[PDB]
Design a protein around this motif. Structure first.
Motif, short mmCIF file in Angstrom:
data_model
loop_
_atom_site.label_atom_id
_atom_site.label_comp_id
_atom_site.label_asym_id
_atom_site.label_seq_id
_atom_site.Cartn_x
_atom_site.Cartn_y
_atom_site.Cartn_z
N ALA A 1 0.87 -1.38 0.01
CA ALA A 1 0.02 -0.17 0.12
C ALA A 1 0.99 1.24 0.04
CB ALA A 1 -0.89 0.14 1.13
N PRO A 2 0.65 2.09 -1.08
CA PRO A 2 1.28 3.32 -1.18
C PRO A 2 0.88 4.18 0.13
CG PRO A 2 0.33 2.95 -3.20
CD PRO A 2 -0.39 2.13 -1.94
N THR A 3 2.03 5.06 0.48
CA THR A 3 1.75 6.29 1.47
C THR A 3 0.95 7.32 0.82
OG1 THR A 3 3.98 7.18 1.02
CG2 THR A 3 3.84 5.81 2.70
N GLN A 4 -0.14 7.67 1.62
CA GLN A 4 -1.25 8.67 1.00
C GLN A 4 -1.26 9.80 2.08
OE1 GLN A 4 -5.45 8.57 -0.02
NE2 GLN A 4 -4.57 8.70 -2.05
N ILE A 5 -1.09 11.02 1.61
CA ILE A 5 -1.68 12.14 2.41
C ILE A 5 -2.69 12.84 2.03
CG2 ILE A 5 -0.72 14.25 3.63
CD1 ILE A 5 2.28 12.93 3.33
N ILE A 6 -3.76 12.97 2.99
CA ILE A 6 -5.03 13.71 2.49
C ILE A 6 -5.09 15.18 2.88
CG2 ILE A 6 -7.43 13.54 2.50
CD1 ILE A 6 -7.24 10.48 2.89
N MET A 7 -5.35 15.84 1.99
CA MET A 7 -5.75 17.57 2.31
C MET A 7 -7.05 17.83 1.94
SD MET A 7 -3.33 20.60 1.28
CE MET A 7 -4.25 22.40 1.12
N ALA A 8 -7.55 18.35 2.82
CA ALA A 8 -9.05 18.81 2.65
C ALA A 8 -9.06 20.34 1.90
CB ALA A 8 -9.85 18.98 4.06
N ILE A 9 -9.87 20.31 0.85
CA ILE A 9 -10.25 21.78 0.44
C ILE A 9 -11.90 21.82 0.16
CG2 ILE A 9 -8.08 21.59 -0.95
CD1 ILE A 9 -9.72 20.49 -3.49
N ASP A 10 -12.05 23.08 -0.36
CA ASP A 10 -13.51 23.25 -0.48
C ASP A 10 -14.08 22.64 -1.54
OD1 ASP A 10 -14.07 25.40 1.52
OD2 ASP A 10 -12.48 26.51 0.26
N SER A 11 -13.47 22.75 -2.88
CA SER A 11 -13.91 22.00 -3.94
C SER A 11 -12.63 22.16 -4.99
CB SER A 11 -15.03 22.55 -4.66
OG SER A 11 -14.66 24.04 -5.17
N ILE A 12 -12.46 21.38 -6.04
CA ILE A 12 -11.41 21.55 -6.83
C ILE A 12 -11.24 23.00 -7.86
CG2 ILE A 12 -11.51 19.17 -7.33
CD1 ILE A 12 -12.76 19.61 -10.35
N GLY A 13 -12.21 23.72 -7.65
CA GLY A 13 -12.20 25.06 -8.33
C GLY A 13 -12.36 25.24 -9.61
N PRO A 14 -12.16 26.31 -10.18
CA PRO A 14 -12.57 26.56 -11.66
C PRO A 14 -11.69 26.23 -12.75
CG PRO A 14 -11.69 28.55 -10.82
CD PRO A 14 -11.38 27.68 -9.56
N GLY A 15 -10.41 25.89 -12.47
CA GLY A 15 -9.56 25.54 -13.64
C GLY A 15 -7.90 25.40 -12.80
N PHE A 16 -7.24 25.19 -13.95
CA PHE A 16 -5.67 24.87 -13.50
C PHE A 16 -4.70 25.46 -14.21
CE2 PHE A 16 -7.15 21.96 -10.13
CZ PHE A 16 -8.29 21.33 -10.49
N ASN A 17 -5.08 26.72 -15.08
CA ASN A 17 -4.13 27.46 -15.51
C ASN A 17 -3.71 28.73 -14.58
OD1 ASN A 17 -2.38 29.19 -17.17
ND2 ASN A 17 -3.66 29.03 -19.20
N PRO A 18 -2.62 28.88 -13.90
CA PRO A 18 -2.62 29.88 -12.96
C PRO A 18 -2.23 31.30 -13.67
CG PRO A 18 -0.93 28.29 -12.90
CD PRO A 18 -1.60 27.83 -13.89
N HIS A 19 -2.19 31.31 -15.01
CA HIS A 19 -1.97 32.56 -15.65
C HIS A 19 -3.54 33.24 -16.03
CE1 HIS A 19 2.20 31.73 -15.87
NE2 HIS A 19 1.85 30.47 -16.28
N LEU A 20 -4.75 32.40 -15.73
CA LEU A 20 -5.98 33.15 -16.19
C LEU A 20 -6.67 33.75 -14.85
CD1 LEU A 20 -7.18 30.24 -18.33
CD2 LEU A 20 -6.40 32.24 -19.31
N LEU A 21 -7.53 34.83 -15.19
CA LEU A 21 -8.09 35.52 -14.24
C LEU A 21 -9.19 34.74 -13.69
CD1 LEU A 21 -8.51 39.05 -15.67
CD2 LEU A 21 -6.80 38.63 -14.07
N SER A 22 -9.71 34.02 -14.60
CA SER A 22 -10.78 32.84 -14.42
C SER A 22 -10.55 31.92 -13.56
CB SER A 22 -11.52 32.18 -15.78
OG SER A 22 -10.29 31.38 -16.23
N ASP A 23 -9.09 31.50 -13.30
CA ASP A 23 -8.76 30.29 -12.33
C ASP A 23 -8.10 30.72 -11.31
OD1 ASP A 23 -9.67 28.81 -14.80
OD2 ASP A 23 -7.87 28.12 -15.26
N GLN A 24 -8.08 31.82 -10.70
CA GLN A 24 -7.54 32.39 -9.51
C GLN A 24 -8.25 31.67 -8.40
OE1 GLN A 24 -4.60 34.84 -9.48
NE2 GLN A 24 -4.88 33.64 -11.33
N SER A 25 -7.52 31.05 -7.49
CA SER A 25 -8.04 29.90 -6.40
C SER A 25 -6.86 29.42 -5.69
CB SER A 25 -8.94 29.15 -7.03
OG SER A 25 -8.84 27.60 -6.44
#
Length: 516
Positions: A1-25
């Motif tokens: 079994a692989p070692t897993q660390i669980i981090m809680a967040i609100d939700s995954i958010g709007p997107g994953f391009n840090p360069h977009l205003l839309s994806d600020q999170s």
């Protein structure tokens, strides 16, 4: 079994391009930190107007230096071993691509520095990038971070603007993206076996929805959740802090919500009408909606600086009453008339005043804020409405073709202040190169100060001091709040410092996290 660390967040958010205003999170910033290569990484520095100093990432680079001062030039020497997850080299092409996107794409993060780039040339088999500038740019260490795989994003559905919304197939860091699950609200990161430096200690890091405060509390209490970064108020903070041996803090997030008016719209061309509209809107109400019950509100009461900046001081002029706002409308030539049978309503020579607030349908929080803004205008007889659009359509289509009168959304916080000022209020950023000044106007009398701050011949603190009144007087931008989150670490996890620079958050040391 692989070692897993669980981090809680609100939700995954709007997107994953840090360069977009839309994806600020905070989620977007966290994943980018862990999976994408950067030229420089930020560390806390209270000596900086920004609160952060940018330090060379030796993992990616051998060096990055000012090579010439005549045509101002920076040369980056990229490591031979540095590669994307598909075995493609991280190269000068990736530098070139990010520059071209930052200068051509609408709705990007404060691109004033990128706009100064004259060229990016590939030297030494792609392993050396020579960047030329039209002028000195002292903040250059903030460029070419969160680098994207050029050969991948170019062909992916959605491209730069939408391609990384729910996908990160090719990365180039300590961790890689295994799965992004919108249904479960989970992001699974795995150690990148094709990483070229010190391997991450955890095998897996799972980001997941925290759920209700009581549920998250019990999960941390049970030891199933190791780390948390979530929104919540004083009650939630107190509940988490009461769990034995749990460390908690409230940190700021690298984003500020703003409402912007489109002053190039004929109905908003009169500054007095703009002042009236903003004066009819309770910014305190907008902030509380933006923060929620489940959150503590940090008001944004300056134009350039965010509350998190070390030199932050409120600069907002005195709040207008409701009668004065309506008085301004009457002076602008507006009257009120009965509503025709198939309340009351505001008209100018028979034409009802109409306000369309644009917002990314991607972002439930901004959408809620826009709606409350519209509610307030409708209460006084203004026909206000909310147009929720796809992020690409919002900045690329709706703004260019004047389909909205206002925009609600996030801006980056923690970035170079001169670049912020130039990008958002500057005259050069109106030119249309997609305009980064979405206001439609600038103040010509302050432009020399903006230019002098940007090239570093004038102290930014002195420029801000001098220009703030003029920025507010344009009556185009209403800052609302800076985003904050509760962070936590349970006793079952090691090497988690709940500290870091504003741009990054708490995941900077995630490669060192161990459990039990």
């Amino acid at each position: 079994a692989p070692t897993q660390i669980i981090m809680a967040i609100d939700s995954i958010g709007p997107g994953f391009n840090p360069h977009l205003l839309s994806d600020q999170s905070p989620v977007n910033a966290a994943i980018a930190s862990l999976v994408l290569p950067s030229s420089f990484r930020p560390v806390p520095d209270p000596t900086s107007p920004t609160g952060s100093r940018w330090e060379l990432d030796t993992t990616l680079l051998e060096s990055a230096e000012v090579t010439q001062e005549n045509p101002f030039t920076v040369t980056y020497k990229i490591r031979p071993e540095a590669q994307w997850t598909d075995n493609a080299p991280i190269a000068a092409d990736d530098y070139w691509y990010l520059w071209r996107q930052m200068v051509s794409q609408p709705g990007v993060v404060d691109p004033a520095g990128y706009d100064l780039i004259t060229g990016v040339q590939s030297v030494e088999g792609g392993k050396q990038a020579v960047v030329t500038f039209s002028q000195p740019y002292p903040a250059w260490r903030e460029l070419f971070n969160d680098i994207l795989p050029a050969h991948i994003v170019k062909d992916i559905p959605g491209g730069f603007g939408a391609g990384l919304a729910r996908a990160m197939p090719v990365t180039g860091g300590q961790f890689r993206v295994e799965t992004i699950d919108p249904q479960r609200d989970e992001i699974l990161l795995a150690r990148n076996d094709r990483f070229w430096s010190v391997p991450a200690k955890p095998d897996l890091v799972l980001f997941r929805r925290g759920g209700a405060p009581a549920a998250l509390a019990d999960s941390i209490r049970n030891g199933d959740t190791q780390v948390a970064q979530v929104h919540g108020g004083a009650a939630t903070f107190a509940q988490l802090s009461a769990i034995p041996d749990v460390r908690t803090a409230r940190i700021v997030t690298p984003r500020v919500m703003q409402l912007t008016l489109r002053a190039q719209q004929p109905k908003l061309a009169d500054p007095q009408v703009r002042k009236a509209i903003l004066g009819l809107i309770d910014v305190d109400l907008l902030a509380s909606v933006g923060a929620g019950d489940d959150n503590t509100v940090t008001l944004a009461q300056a134009q350039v600086r965010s509350p998190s900046d070390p030199g932050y001081v409120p600069t907002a002029p005195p709040a207008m009453t409701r009668d004065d706002a309506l008085e301004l409308l009457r002076d602008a030539g507006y009257v009120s008339e009965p509503v025709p049978p198939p309340r009351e309503r505001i008209v100018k020579d028979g034409v009802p005043l109409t306000i369309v607030l644009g917002v990314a349908s991607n972002d439930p929080t901004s959408v809620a804020v826009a709606n409350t803004a519209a509610d307030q205008l409708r209460n006084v007889g203004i026909d206000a409405s909310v147009l929720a659009l796809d992020p690409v359509a919002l900045y690329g289509d709706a703004l260019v073709n004047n389909r909205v009168d206002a925009v609600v959304g996030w801006r980056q916080a923690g970035g170079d202040l001169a670049t912020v000022l130039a990008s958002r209020y500057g005259c050069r950023a109106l030119e249309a190169q997609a305009p980064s000044n979405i206001t439609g106007i600038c103040d010509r009398s302050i432009q020399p100060r903006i230019d002098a701050a940007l090239d570093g011949t004038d102290d930014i603190a002195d420029v801000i001091q001098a220009v703030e009144p003029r920025l507010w007087n344009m009556a185009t931008v209403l800052p609302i709040l800076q985003d904050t989150t509760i962070v936590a670490a349970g006793p079952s996890v090691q090497n988690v410092s709940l500290t870091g620079a504003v741009p990054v958050g708490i995941v900077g040391d995630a490669g060192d996290w161990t459990k039990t």
